Design a protein around this ligand. Structure first.
Ligand code: K
Ligand code: K
Ligand code: K
Ligand code: K
Ligand code: K
Ligand code: K
Ligand code: K
Ligand code: K
Ligand code: K
Ligand code: K
Ligand code: K
Ligand code: K
Ligand code: K
Ligand code: K
Ligand code: K
Ligand code: MG
Ligand code: MG
Ligand code: MG
Ligand code: MG
Ligand code: MG
Ligand code: MG
Ligand code: MG
Ligand code: MG
Ligand code: MG
Ligand code: MG
Ligand code: MG
Ligand code: MG
Ligand code: MG
Ligand code: MG
Ligand code: MG
Ligand code: MG
Ligand code: MG
Ligand code: MG
Ligand code: MG
Ligand code: MG
Ligand code: MG
Ligand code: MG
Ligand code: MG
Ligand code: MG
Ligand code: MG
Ligand code: MG
Ligand code: MG
Ligand code: MG
Ligand code: MG
Ligand code: MG
Ligand code: MG
Ligand code: MG
Ligand code: MG
Ligand code: MG
Ligand code: MG
Ligand code: MG
Ligand code: MG
Lengths: 197, 386, 113
RNA sequence: UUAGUGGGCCAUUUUUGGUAAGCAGAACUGGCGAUGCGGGAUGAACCGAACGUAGAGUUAAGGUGCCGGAAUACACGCUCAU
RNA sequence: GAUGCCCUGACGAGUAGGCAGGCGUGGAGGUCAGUGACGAAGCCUAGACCGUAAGGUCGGGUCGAACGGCCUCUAGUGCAG
RNA sequence: GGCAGUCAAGCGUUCAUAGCGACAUUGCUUUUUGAUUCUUCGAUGUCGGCUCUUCCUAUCAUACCGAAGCAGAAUUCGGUAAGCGUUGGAUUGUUCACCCACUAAUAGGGAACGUGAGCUGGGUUUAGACCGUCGUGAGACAGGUUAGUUUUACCCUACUGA
RNA sequence: AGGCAUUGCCGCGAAGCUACCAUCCGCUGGAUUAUGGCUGAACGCCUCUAAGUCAGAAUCCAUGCUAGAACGCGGUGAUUUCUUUGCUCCACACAAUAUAGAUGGAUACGAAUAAGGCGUCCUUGUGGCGUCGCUGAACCAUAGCAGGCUAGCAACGGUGCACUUGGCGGAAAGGCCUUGGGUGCUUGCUGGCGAAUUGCAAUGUCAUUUUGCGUGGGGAUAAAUCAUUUGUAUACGACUUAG
C-alpha cells in the first residue's frame, strides 16, 4: 500500500523475515530494513557461531578471492538469506534486489519515518517461550564485524532525539484528544456517532 | 600420495600479492592508540634514508657475556629536516568506517607543496589554492566555521604536513605531503594545536627521543621481474635438468585442475610496502651542530657525514635520526617513522644507549681515515699540497 | 589486428595501449592522399575544407613464395598485399484521432478560452 | 511372399554360484532398448501417464515459507542435537 | 472432377524394417500454334503469397540467349559427415 | 589387509575392566591384495626418486588437560587439538626394508597408486649380446646379466606479475 | 704508445648485486575447546547443568601486518573564453528521451511480552488509582470545469505559494521545526450562473527521468597527455623526477 515499507528488523527471525521480504520485492514493493543488528536467529549462540564457522571453511581452493564471500556485517548476513530466496542471477531477480536496502541502525532519512513489523516473523510470536536464540549483532561481532560499538553509540543518540520528538507529540495528542472530547455532545458529534463515527 | 619428506613452505602468504606498491610513499595503516590525558603531539614523522654506518657502544645487559663490553653495530641515518604543517582533516566515525568530514588548509603554501598538485609545473599558471587563500580575507570566518565543524563532529584529527625537500641534497623539488595523526588532548585541543602551527615547522626532536623504539614504514627497493628461485627461495633443480633449472618442478597435482595461489611463480620482486617494527633510536642529531658525529668518548669535532658524502646521497646538513640496524627502502627514499603501537618492556627495549664512537670513513671504498686531518697527519705532505 | 603486439604511451591519445608506426603502410597511404588532393585541385574543389570521407583497404590476391622447414617439408611464405581506395570531400553545413479524442481536444480548447 | 533380428539390459517376486559386487547364471511378468510428456534437483529402466494440431474444464504421481504454480491451513502429540 | 460429391463412427507414440502418396534434377515422345533481346537462363534480395513438408509462386536488383507448364518415357537423378 | 567397538572367562601379589583380555560377536576404512570387467585398444605416456603445493586425522613432537599398579624422576592409558614441525646418512632402481646418527619428534596417509610438453631414466618393457634351466629345433623364461633417440606450447583457461 | 690472441692470462680492484658466508626486525587483546569449578533444581538429600554462571589450549575472531572492489565510498585543489564567443549556474520556453511501473497520505518514542500503552494523583516510586487492546476493518484527508465564473453570512480558524525570523540536525546530515508580514484558496453556512454532441465504453493522455536547442539574467578565466628529461623505477606499458 505504501510506496516504500520500512521494516524494523529488531526482534524478527532471520529466515522468516527473509522469506517475506523476498516475496514482497518479487511483487514490486520497495522495502527498507533497519536495525539489522537486532535481528534474531533461533538456536543458542554457540550453535549459530558453529554454523558460521562451517560457512567460513568454504572457499575456492585454488584462489580464495573467487568466493564464496563471507560477509560479516548483520545487514549482509540478512542480505545473504534474502539473496538465496530470489532468483538472483536473472534480470527479474536483479531488479527485485534493487528494490531492497538493509541497514544497521536507523540512518537518515529513515530515522524520521514510520517503521512496521512483520508478525509472521516476530520472535515473540513464533518461538515457544524457553527456546534459546541468537542476536545477530553478537554473532556478527564474533565472526569479525567491526562496528558494533559505533552503531550502539549512534543508536543511543538517535533514541535521545526520538524520545524528545515523542514527548512533544504526546503533549500535542492531549490537546487534540481534549478538544475532541468537548466536541462530543454536539449535534454534529451525535449525528456522526449514528453513522459509526 | 603424500610428499616423501616434510619441509616448511617457501615464503609467507601474509605478504601477498608481491606486487608493485601503489605509491612510492608507504601508507601508515595504524597510528598509536590515543591517550587523551597527554599533551598534543605528532605520532609520526617523515624523513629520507641517507645511508648506513657503524657505531661502537658499551652493552648494558646484565647476564650477557658481553655485559659492559664494546659491541659494534650497524645503524641507519634518516635525514629529517623539520616538517611544515599546512592543514587539518577531521574524521568522523560511521558504521562504514572513518570518513573525512572536512579539510582546512593554511593561508600560504610554499612552492615545495604547491608542486605536489601538478604533473607539469613549468607550464602551469600556478593557480592552486588561489581562490582558497581568499577565504582567509576579512576576519576569515569561512575558516573559523570549518574549524568549528571539526571540533563539533570529529572523532580523530590529523594534520597535513610536508617535507622540506629543498633542504635535502635530492634533485626532486616537489615535497611529499602526508596526514599524521595528533594524539593527546581533546578534539578541541587538537584542532587548536593544528591551527596555531599552520605554516610553522615541527622538528624531529619534538616527536622522537633517544632510546625510543620506532617503526619504519617504507617502500622496499625494486628489483623488477624475478624468477622463482630468488623471489621465493625455492631449491635450484639439478644440473641435468632440460628446459632450465631456476624453477619449481611441480606446480600442482592433477586435481584441483588449476594452479593454486599458494604455488611459487615468477614476477615482480621488491617495491613492496613494508612496516618494520622495534628500531631503537640511538641518536637524534641536530643540523646546526658541527659535532653531530662526535661523542663523549670521541671528542673529534665532526659531522655524521662520512668522508666523500653518503654514497648516492650527499651531506646531511639537517636534523637526523640514527636507528639501530636497517629499515626498508633504499637511499633517497621517503620514509615514515612512527611511534610504537605498544609499550615494550623488554630489557632490550628499555636499555639506555650511549655511543662511544661513530664511524665516518668513506663508504665509497675501503676508507681508512675518519677525517681530512687524520688523513693529512698519517700521509704527511703530498705533491698537490705544495 | 593487434594480437600480441607491444604497448606504448603514444597509444594514450586514442585510448589504447597497443599502437605502432607502420612506415610502409604510411608511405603508400600518403601517396594516395597526395593523388586525391591533386585530383580535387583539378576539379577545382576548395582544399581548405577537404576531409577524408571514405577510406577502405581490401585484400588483394596473395603472392606466393615457399619456406623450407625441418624434415624435408615445404610451407607457404605469402605476401598479403592491399587494394586501397579513398575519397576526399568538401565539408558543407497526418494525424488520426478517434471521435473521442476529437471531442476531448474541442472540450479542452472551450475551457482554455 | 519378403524385410530387419539372431551382442541385450533393468525392476518387483521365485532362484543358483559367490564374503560380496553397479558380479556371474536361470524362472514368470512388466519395462528400457525403439519413448517423448508430468513427478523423483539431477539420471535409459522408479512413480504417474504413453504423444496428430488447437481451445476450455478436471485430475494422476508429486507438491503448496521463499526460490516456485499452490494454506507461514486446521488438529493432537513428540523432538533441542558444542 | 463417381479416381467425384457427401453422411456416420472410431482411431493417431516409434529405432531396425516394410508399404503407400507426393516434391525435386539431366535427357526423350507429345502438347500449350507456351515465355523471351521491349531481356531467356543463372545469381543476390532480415520484401510478398501458397503448401504439414519435400517445394512452388511473385516483386526488386544484377545479367545477356535461351527456357518453361501439363500428359507420358528414361536415368550417371537429390549429401553434412 | 588395516583400524575400532561390545561381552568379560582370565591375567594383573590382593583386585574382571590402572593396564590388559580368551571364547564369542557388531562395525568402520579403501594407504593391502583379491573379486569383477562398466569406461578407455583411430593410444589418458607405463616403476622409483628429485621438485613443489595443498588436504585428511586414525596425534610422533609441541599447547592445555583427565587417569594410573601417578612419591620424585621416567613412563603408560585417555581428551580438546592437524596451529606448528616431523631430519642428515651407509647398502638397494627400488616402493618396502635395514642399520648409523642427530633430534622436541624423526606419526600415518590422500590429491589420476599427485606430479615425464617439470626433470631424470637406475628398473621395467622392442630390436644387439652372454649365462643357466627348458626345447630335436626355430625359440621360451613374471630367472640372472650388459648396451640401448625421453619430441611440441606462440592458443584457451588457471596461476604469477603488468 | 698501441692492435690482435672470439673478455689472451695473472694480482689487486671501486660501484652495483649479493650470503644464516653478512647484519637487523618478527605485535597484544577478546571469545572459546577439553578440563576443573560456582550457585543450583530435577530427585525435601546429592549433583559443574537443567535455568544461570567462573577460569581455561599451540584453537578461533580481532589488534597488527599485505592487497584495495579496475562497476565500493569520502574530503580537498584547480577547472580553458580572451576568435568560430567556448564553459558554468539560474529562470523560461521548445524539442526529443524513456520509465522494473505515481494515480489521496512511507502517518517517526523506547522497552517489555510470565507484560505493556494512555490518562490521572502524590509520599516521584520496580508508587496508588482509572482506562485501552481482543489488529491499520485505523487515523488523517476526502464535495466544486482533473474541479469553472460570481454574491453574501459566520468565524479570525484551516490550508497553498513565494518571501522572511531564529534554531536544531554529519550515520547516508541535504531534512525537521520556528517568527513575521504578504498573497491566494476555503465545502464552516446560504445563494446565482456554467457544463450537453467524447454521441451507450475505449489510459482517453494530468506523472517522472535524461539530454539537446533557443532566449534573458548571473558567474568563472585551467590542465593533462605526447615529445624531451631523471633513475629511488622498468620486459613493454607503468612508475618516480626536471624543464
Ligand atoms: K608423492
Ligand atoms: K607482444
Ligand atoms: K527370418
Ligand atoms: K535369420
Ligand atoms: K516410458
Ligand atoms: K525425470
Ligand atoms: K491415474
Ligand atoms: K534458490
Ligand atoms: K515441352
Ligand atoms: K578394466
Ligand atoms: K587402450
Ligand atoms: K636432524
Ligand atoms: K652405448
Ligand atoms: K687485451
Ligand atoms: K552445590
Ligand atoms: Mg579480515
Ligand atoms: Mg608427510
Ligand atoms: Mg634473502
Ligand atoms: Mg637431458
Ligand atoms: Mg661502499
Ligand atoms: Mg595474449
Ligand atoms: Mg627453414
Ligand atoms: Mg632435405
Ligand atoms: Mg536374412
Ligand atoms: Mg549364435
Ligand atoms: Mg551380431
Ligand atoms: Mg555383464
Ligand atoms: Mg540396438
Ligand atoms: Mg533425488
Ligand atoms: Mg507462489
Ligand atoms: Mg505414427
Ligand atoms: Mg545423364
Ligand atoms: Mg532475368
Ligand atoms: Mg542472405
Ligand atoms: Mg552472347
Ligand atoms: Mg550417383
Ligand atoms: Mg559438402
Ligand atoms: Mg548422413
Ligand atoms: Mg582420440
Ligand atoms: Mg596423447
Ligand atoms: Mg595427458
Ligand atoms: Mg581425533
Ligand atoms: Mg587409491
Ligand atoms: Mg601416479
Ligand atoms: Mg616426457
Ligand atoms: Mg613418474
Ligand atoms: Mg604432466
Ligand atoms: Mg635402462
Ligand atoms: Mg632387449
Ligand atoms: Mg612473443
Ligand atoms: Mg547451561
Ligand atoms: Mg580502487
Amino acid at each position: 500500500v505504501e510506496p516504500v515499507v520500512v521494516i524494523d528488523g529488531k526482534g524478527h527471525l532471520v529466515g522468516r523475515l527473509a522469506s517475506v521480504v523476498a516475496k514482497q520485492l518479487l511483487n514490486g514493493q520497495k522495502i527498507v530494513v533497519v536495525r539489522a543488528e537486532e535481528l534474531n536467529i533461533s538456536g543458542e549462540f554457540f550453535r549459530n557461531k558453529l554454523k558460521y564457522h562451517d560457512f567460513l571453511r568454504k572457499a575456492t581452493a585454488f584462489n580464495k578471492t573467487r568466493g564464496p564471500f563471507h560477509f560479516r556485517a548483520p545487514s549482509r548476513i540478512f542480505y545473504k538469506a534474502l539473496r538465496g530466496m530470489v532468483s538472483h542471477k536473472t534480470a527479474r531477480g536483479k531488479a527485485a534486489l534493487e528494490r531492497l536496502k538493509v541497514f544497521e541502525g536507523i540512518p537518515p532519512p529513515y530515522d524520521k519515518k514510520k517503521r512496521v513489523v512483520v508478525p509472521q516473523a516476530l520472535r515473540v510470536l513464533r518461538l515457544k517461550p524457553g527456546r534459546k536464540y541468537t542476536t545477530l549483532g553478537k554473532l556478527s561481532t564474533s565472526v569479525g564485524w567491526k562496528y558494533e560499538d559505533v552503531v550502539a553509540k549512534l543508536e543511543a543518540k538517535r533514541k535521545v532525539s526520538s524520545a524528545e520528538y515523542y514527548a512533544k507529540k504526546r503533549a500535542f495528542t492531549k490537546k487534540v484528544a481534549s478538544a475532541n472530547a468537548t466536541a462530543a455532545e454536539s449535534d454534529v458529534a451525535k449525528q456522526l456517532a449514528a453513522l459509526g463515527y | 600420495s603424500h610428499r616423501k619428506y616434510e619441509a616448511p613452505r617457501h615464503g609467507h602468504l601474509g605478504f601477498l600479492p608481491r606486487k608493485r606498491a601503489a605509491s612510492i610513499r608507504a601508507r601508515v595503516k595504524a597510528f598509536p592508540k590515543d591517550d587523551r590525558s597527554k599533551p598534543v603531539a605528532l605520532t609520526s614523522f617523515l624523513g629520507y634514508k641517507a645511508g648506513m654506518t657503524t657505531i661502537v657502544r658499551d652493552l648494558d645487559r646484565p647476564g650477557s657475556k658481553f655485559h659492559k663490553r664494546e659491541v659494534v653495530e650497524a645503524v641507519t641515518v634518516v635525514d629529517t629536516p623539520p616538517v611544515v604543517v599546512v592543514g587539518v582533516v577531521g574524521y568522523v566515525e560511521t558504521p562504514r568506517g572513518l570518513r573525512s568530514l572536512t579539510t582546512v588548509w593554511a593561508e600560504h603554501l610554499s612552492d615545495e607543496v604547491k608542486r605536489r598538485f601538478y604533473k607539469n609545473w613549468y607550464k602551469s599558471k600556478k593557480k592552486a589554492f588561489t581562490k582558497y587563500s581568499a577565504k582567509y580575507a576579512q576576519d576569515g570566518a569561512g575558516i573559523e566555521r570549518e574549524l568549528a565543524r571539526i571540533k563539533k563532529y570529529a572523532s580523530v584529527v590529523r594534520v597535513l604536513v610536508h617535507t622540506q625537500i629543498r633542504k635535502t641534497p635530492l634533485a626532486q623539488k616537489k615535497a611529499h605531503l602526508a596526514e599524521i595523526q595528533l594524539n593527546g588532548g581533546s578534539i578541541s585541543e587538537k584542532v587548536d594545536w593544528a591551527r596555531e602551527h599552520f605554516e610553522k615547522t615541527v622538528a624531529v626532536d619534538s616527536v622522537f627521543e633517544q632510546n625510543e623504539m620506532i617503526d619504519a614504514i617504507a617502500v622496499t627497493k625494486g628489483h623488477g621481474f624475478e624468477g622463482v628461485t630468488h623471489r621465493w627461495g625455492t631449491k635450484k633443480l639439478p644440473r641435468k635438468t632440460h628446459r632450465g633449472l631456476r624453477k619449481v618442478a611441480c606446480i600442482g597435482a592433477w586435481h584441483p585442475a588449476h594452479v593454486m595461489w599458494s604455488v611459487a611463480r615468477a614476477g615482480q620482486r621488491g617495491y613492496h610496502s613494508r612496516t618494520s617494527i622495534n628500531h631503537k633510536i640511538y641518536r637524534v642529531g641536530k643540523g646546526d651542530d658541527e659535532a653531530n658525529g662526535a661523542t663523549s668518548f670521541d671528542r673529534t669535532k665532526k659531522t655524521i657525514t662520512p668522508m666523500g658524502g653518503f654514497v648516492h646521497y650527499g651531506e646531511i646538513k639537517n636534523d637526523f635520526i640514527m636507528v639501530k640496524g636497517c629499515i626498508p627502502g633504499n637511499r633517497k627514499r621517503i620514509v615514515t617513522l612512527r611511534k610504537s603501537l605498544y609499550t615494550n618492556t623488554s630489557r632490550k627495549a628499555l636499555e639506555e644507549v650511549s655511543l662511544k664512537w661513530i664511524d665516518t670513513a668513506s663508504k665509497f671504498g675501503k676508507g681508512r681515515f675518519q677525517t681530512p686531518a687524520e688523513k693529512h697527519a698519517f700521509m704527511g705532505t703530498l705533491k698537490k699540497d705544495l | 589486428f593487434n594480437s600480441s603486439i607491444g604497448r606504448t604511451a603514444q597509444g594514450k591519445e586514442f585510448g589504447v595501449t597497443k599502437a605502432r608506426w607502420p612506415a610502409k603502410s604510411v608511405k603508400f597511404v600518403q601517396g594516395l592522399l597526395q593523388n586525391a588532393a591533386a585530383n580535387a585541385e583539378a576539379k577545382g574543389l576548395d582544399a581548405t575544407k577537404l576531409y577524408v570521407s571514405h577510406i577502405q583497404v581490401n585484400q588483394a590476391p596473395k603472392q606466393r613464395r615457399r619456406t623450407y622447414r625441418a624434415h624435408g617439408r615445404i610451407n607457404k611464405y605469402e605476401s598479403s598485399p592491399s587494394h586501397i581506395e579513398l575519397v576526399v570531400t568538401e565539408k558543407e553545413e497526418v494525424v488520426r484521432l478517434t471521435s473521442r479524442q476529437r471531442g476531448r481536444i474541442a472540450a479542452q480548447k472551450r475551457i482554455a478560452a
